Design a protein around this ligand. Structure first.
Ligand SMILES: CO[C@H]1[C@H](O)[C@@H](O)[C@@H](O[C@H]2[C@H](O[C@@H]3CO[C@@H](O[C@@H]4CO[C@H](O)[C@H](O)[C@H]4O)[C@H](O)[C@H]3O)OC[C@@H](O)[C@@H]2O)O[C@@H]1C(=O)O
Ligand SMILES: [Cl-]
Ligand SMILES: [Cl-]
Ligand SMILES: [Cl-]
Ligand SMILES: [Mg+2]
Length: 333
């Protein structure tokens, strides 16, 4: 059954692509099963503004035009991150040639110009953007203080603990100026089943959205939280459920943005763990169907195990020959 038909009334079904997925049998498989795609790499900061003022949209524009011509939607990923992001945005070389943070004013100017120029370039060719990715430390010991729980990344070091909020405000201004665009703004992160990290992300989004809503008649600044769903055979779906509930209580939409389930290593998937992997996918989709009114999209991070970013750990619904694994039957249910 095509995945997007099974879940047609529940959430968009997504995948995560490179230029390889837009031709041949892979394109057919992609179109048959998914309503939406995320660029695995082509819309990251390193790909779109590799040096200051040098915006490079040609490959990303070809990808998005082909995705749309082929009947699918595009989720935009990602405007602000501490990986795949050029050092010029938030650092410089001191005299003694050490890498040090830029000052707040200059980093804020780079942050805003990146977000605004990229969003204005694509316009409403995307349905959503991951504005800020992975800003939270793992297993934070004091999630009551979100700011102290933030990863001290290059953006934090140049701008300060308010940079996640400044990123969203810059994105929100573009949508205020282009009111006909329908684009949801998301904050995206992983290990969101760790109850400490989920509390810290909840506290961040709550503080930022409460202050915005008080000033703007109840409007959301952060529209969405992306649970990346980089899960493993020991992931406890009860902790997923607690986290999904917590985020829903913000009044945001949720997406499961980069779903995969590592099982095995060294490219070897034992038969009993193919069955364990299928069983956990089936438990997760049972959970997602139960919360479908608050879940906009569930995206798998890749098509098949040999082309996963974690290929060694056999994470996905199809094998290297594009043949359905037990996982696939677990999802279709
Ligand atoms: C051991 O070094 C390895 C890198 O650290 C590892 O990430 C990988 O780098 C590649 C790059 O691969 C993409 C990495 O991003 C993946 O997607 C991200 C997953 O992390 C978050 O959850 C993000 O939100 C999500 O965007 C992509 O799926 C991977 O394709 O691809 C460009 C390549 O030039 C880098 O080297 O591999 C490194 C390695 O040495 O193997
Ligand atoms: Cl092919
Ligand atoms: Cl073509
Ligand atoms: Cl408009
Ligand atoms: Mg890509």
């Amino acid at each position: 059954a095509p995945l997007k038909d099974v879940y047609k009334n529940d959430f968009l079904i997504g995948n995560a692509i490179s230029a390889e997925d837009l031709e041949g049998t892979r394109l057919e498989l992609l179109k048959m099963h998914h309503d939406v795609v995320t660029a695995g790499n082509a819309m990251k900061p390193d790909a779109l503004q590799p040096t200051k003022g040098n915006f490079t949209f040609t490959a990303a524009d070809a990808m998005i035009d082909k995705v749309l011509a082929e009947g699918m939607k595009m989720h935009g990923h990602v405007l602000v991150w501490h990986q795949q992001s050029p050092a010029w945005l938030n650092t410089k070389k001191d005299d003694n040639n050490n890498t040090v943070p830029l000052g707040r004013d200059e980093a804020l100017d780079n942050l805003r110009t990146h977000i605004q120029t990229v969003m204005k370039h694509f316009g409403n060719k995307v349905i959503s953007w991951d504005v800020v990715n992975e800003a939270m430390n793992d297993n934070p010991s004091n999630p009551a203080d979100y700011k102290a729980s933030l990863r001290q990344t290059p953006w934090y070091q140049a701008i300060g603990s308010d940079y996640v909020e400044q990123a969203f405000l810059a994105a929100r201004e573009v949508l205020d100026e282009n009111p006909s665009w329908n684009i949801k703004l998301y904050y995206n992160d992983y290990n969101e089943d760790n109850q400490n990290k989920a509390t810290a992300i909840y506290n961040m989004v709550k503080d930022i959205n409460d202050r915005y809503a008080a000033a703007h008649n109840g409007k959301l600044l952060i529209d969405g939280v992306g649970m990346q769903g980089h899960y493993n055979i020991n992931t406890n779906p009860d902790n997923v459920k607690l986290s999904l509930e917590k985020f829903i209580s913000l009044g945001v939409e949720v997406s499961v943005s980069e779903l995969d389930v590592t099982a095995g290593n060294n490219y070897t998937l034992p038969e009993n763990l193919a069955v364990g992997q299928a069983y956990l996918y089936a438990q997760l989709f049972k959970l997602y169907k139960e919360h479908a009114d608050h879940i906009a999209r569930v995206t798998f991070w890749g098509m098949d195990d040999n082309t996963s970013w974690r290929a060694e750990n056999n994470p996905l619904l199809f094998d290297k020959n594009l043949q359905a694994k037990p996982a696939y039957y677990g999802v279709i249910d």
